[PDB]
């Protein structure tokens, strides 16, 4: 059974956590408790393949972010379609994984989290599919930690991704 | 941000970072509040200090770093092994004075998530006793749990290989036994997956884990090293198993169940120095010695569950 390390990055809450935790646990964690370092191990099927996911849901800001970048072999980029700022904080951490890892070929998806929240989007599916095409025609899903939409798509993408 | 931190582990190896508010001297109790749980989930845990040949439940008011700083002095005292091999690591796990009966009062889908976690780990590594048809609908209810729904396409042949048996049965059993249990396995997983009366509910396969767990004698049980003479005195190395239930003994070899004794069926007599301890099989006319320098946390673990029965 191969193992796949992944790393959850993004600007403080956002539903790194949120998302992680539905995932491995099938729970929707409410309260807002700002993380110092969590790690998560599942299995699961992927492309007919029994797969260890090992998850590293990080802090909103540093520390440990170039050995998360080394170690990682797939990166999910997280912003809330509900905050600009976390938007616009994601093309530092895009540019700091291609330095780190010293290329263009990185396992990496794009998620604009908490698209449950529609009323109060600020950010457009639109500009997500923009920044997407950009960096690379990088892999980009809407996502929801609270309804359950396209929370098992973010992993097994990156799975995909690291296969190739 | 010069702030001290520690990694508390689960026993699927993940881990929570909880800052140490107070260095070195933060207490289990501080950590517990540093953890992501509900006082709903926390009732039923608490922190563990562990290396790969001791395992101490600490308490509220004790020290974890204190003792991760102590181990070498820990380990000369409670055992023979050589602290080179041991740097020990901080878990939560199960209180072993949890009672049975608090335990299946439990909804909460995290407290139920650990206590499968931790549960499916006993398992696997051979601590729980019981006969080939229990081991078979446990080993049913993992492949639901973590391969999903039965299909006949993908799980009736070349499926069940040792590789994906391994996962699902007693380590102890995976060579010789599981091999032959495979045809049984699939028939509970298929009878699971298309019984429409059976919550799929991640929480609900994880209690129906949990509930046959419940009923193996060694179930919750927090685990001694010691050694036993035969009576011609060949030396046996043990496990000591003391839970809510009983004292339950098992060959550290082979993990086979030695002797398992019901509180108010045996008592107890702890050695002149805490090396020793004594159990009389109340009307059975048996009586054997254990040798452990954990012979006076066997015997303070058996007075407090003992006492705890009302
Ligand atoms: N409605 C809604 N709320 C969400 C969603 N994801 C997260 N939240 C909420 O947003 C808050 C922060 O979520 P959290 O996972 O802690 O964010 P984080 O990115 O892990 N924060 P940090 O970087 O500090 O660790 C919580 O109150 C959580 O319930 C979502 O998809 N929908
Ligand atoms: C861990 C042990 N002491 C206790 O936890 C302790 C606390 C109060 C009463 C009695 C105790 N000793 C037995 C145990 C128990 O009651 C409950 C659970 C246990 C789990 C595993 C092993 C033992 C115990 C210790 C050892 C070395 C240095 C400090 C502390
Ligand atoms: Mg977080």
Same mark, same amino acid.
């Given at each position: 059974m191969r193992e796949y390390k992944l790393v959850v990055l993004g600007?403080?809450?956002?539903?790194?956590?949120?998302?992680?935790?539905?995932?491995?646990?099938?729970?929707?964690?409410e309260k807002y408790d700002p993380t110092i370092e969590d790690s998560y191990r599942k299995q699961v099927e992927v492309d007919a393949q029994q797969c260890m996911l090992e998850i590293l849901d990080t802090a909103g800001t540093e520390a440990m972010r170039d050995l998360y970048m080394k170690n990682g072999q797939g990166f999910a980029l997280v912003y809330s379609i509900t905050a600009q700022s976390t938007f616009n904080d994601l093309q530092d951490l895009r540019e700091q994984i291609l330095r780190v890892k010293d290329t263009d070929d990185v %396992?990496?998806?794009?998620?604009?989290?908490?698209?449950?929240?529609?009323?109060?989007?600020?950010?457009?599916?639109?500009?997500?599919?923009?920044?997407?095409?950009?960096?690379?025609?990088?892999? #980009?899903?809407?996502?929801?930690?609270?309804?359950?939409?396209?929370?098992?798509?973010?992993?097994?993408?990156l799975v995909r991704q690291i296969n190739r | 941000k010069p702030y001290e931190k520690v990694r508390i582990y689960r026993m699927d190896g993940?881990?929570?970072?909880?800052?140490?508010?107070?260095?070195?001297?933060?207490?289990?109790?501080?950590?517990?509040?540093?953890?992501?749980?509900?006082?709903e989930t926390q009732q039923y845990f608490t922190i563990w200090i562990?290396?790969?040949?001791?395992?101490?439940?600490?308490?509220?008011?004790?020290?974890? +770093?204190?003792?991760?700083?102590?181990?070498?002095?820990?380990?000369?005292?409670?055992?023979?092994?050589?602290?080179?091999?041991?740097? %020990?690591?901080? #878990?939560?796990?199960?209180?072993?004075?949890?009672? +049975?009966?608090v335990e299946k009062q439990?909804?909460?889908?995290?407290?139920? *998530?650990?206590?499968?976690?931790?549960?499916?780990?006993?398992?696997?590594?051979? #601590?729980?006793?019981? %006969?080939?048809?229990?081991?078979?609908?446990?080993?049913?209810?993992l492949l639901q749990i973590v391969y999903g729904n039965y299909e006949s396409k993908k799980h009736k042949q070349g499926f069940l290989?040792?590789?994906?048996?391994?996962?699902?049965?007693?380590?102890?059993? +995976?060579?010789?036994?599981?091999?032959?249990?495979?045809?049984?396995?699939?028939?509970?997983?298929?009878? *699971?997956?298309?019984?429409?009366?059976?919550?799929?509910?991640?929480?609900?396969?994880?209690?129906?884990?949990?509930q046959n767990c419940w009923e193996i004698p060694t179930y919750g049980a927090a685990f001694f090293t010691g050694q036993i003479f035969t009576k011609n005195h060949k030396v046996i190395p043990v496990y000591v198993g003391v839970n809510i239930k009983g004292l339950h003994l098992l060959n550290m070899e082979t993990?086979?169940?030695?002797?398992?004794?019901?509180?108010?069926?045996?008592?107890?007599?702890?050695?002149?120095?805490?090396?020793?301890?004594?159990?009389?099989?109340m009307e059975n006319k048996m009586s054997f010695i254990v040798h452990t320098k954990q012979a006076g946390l066997v015997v303070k673990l058996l007075m407090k569950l003992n006492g705890q029965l009302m």
């Open positions: 600007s403080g809450g956002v539903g790194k956590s949120a998302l992680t935790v539905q995932f491995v646990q099938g729970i929707f964690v %396992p990496m998806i794009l998620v604009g989290n908490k698209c449950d929240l529609e009323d109060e989007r600020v950010v457009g599916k639109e500009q997500g599919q923009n920044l997407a095409r950009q960096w690379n025609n990088c892999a #980009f899903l809407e996502s929801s930690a609270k309804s359950k939409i396209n929370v098992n798509e973010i992993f097994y993408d | 993940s881990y929570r970072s909880v800052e140490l508010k107070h260095g070195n001297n933060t207490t289990v109790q501080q950590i517990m509040e540093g953890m992501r749980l509900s006082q562990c290396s790969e040949n001791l395992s101490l439940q600490l308490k509220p008011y004790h020290k974890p +770093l204190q003792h991760v700083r102590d181990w070498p002095e820990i380990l000369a005292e409670l055992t023979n092994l050589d602290p080179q091999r041991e740097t %020990p690591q901080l #878990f939560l796990r199960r209180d072993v004075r949890l009672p +049975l009966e439990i909804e909460d889908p995290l407290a139920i *998530l650990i206590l499968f976690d931790e549960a499916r780990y006993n398992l696997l590594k051979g #601590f729980y006793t019981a %006969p080939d048809a229990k081991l078979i609908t446990l080993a049913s209810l290989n040792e590789e994906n048996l391994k996962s699902i049965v007693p380590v102890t059993k +995976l060579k010789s036994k599981a091999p032959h249990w495979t045809n049984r396995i699939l028939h509970e997983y298929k009878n *699971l997956s298309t019984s429409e009366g059976v919550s799929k509910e991640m929480h609900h396969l994880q209690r129906m884990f949990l993990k086979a169940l030695l002797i398992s004794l019901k509180y108010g069926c045996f008592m107890w007599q702890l050695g002149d120095t805490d090396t020793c301890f004594q159990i009389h099989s």
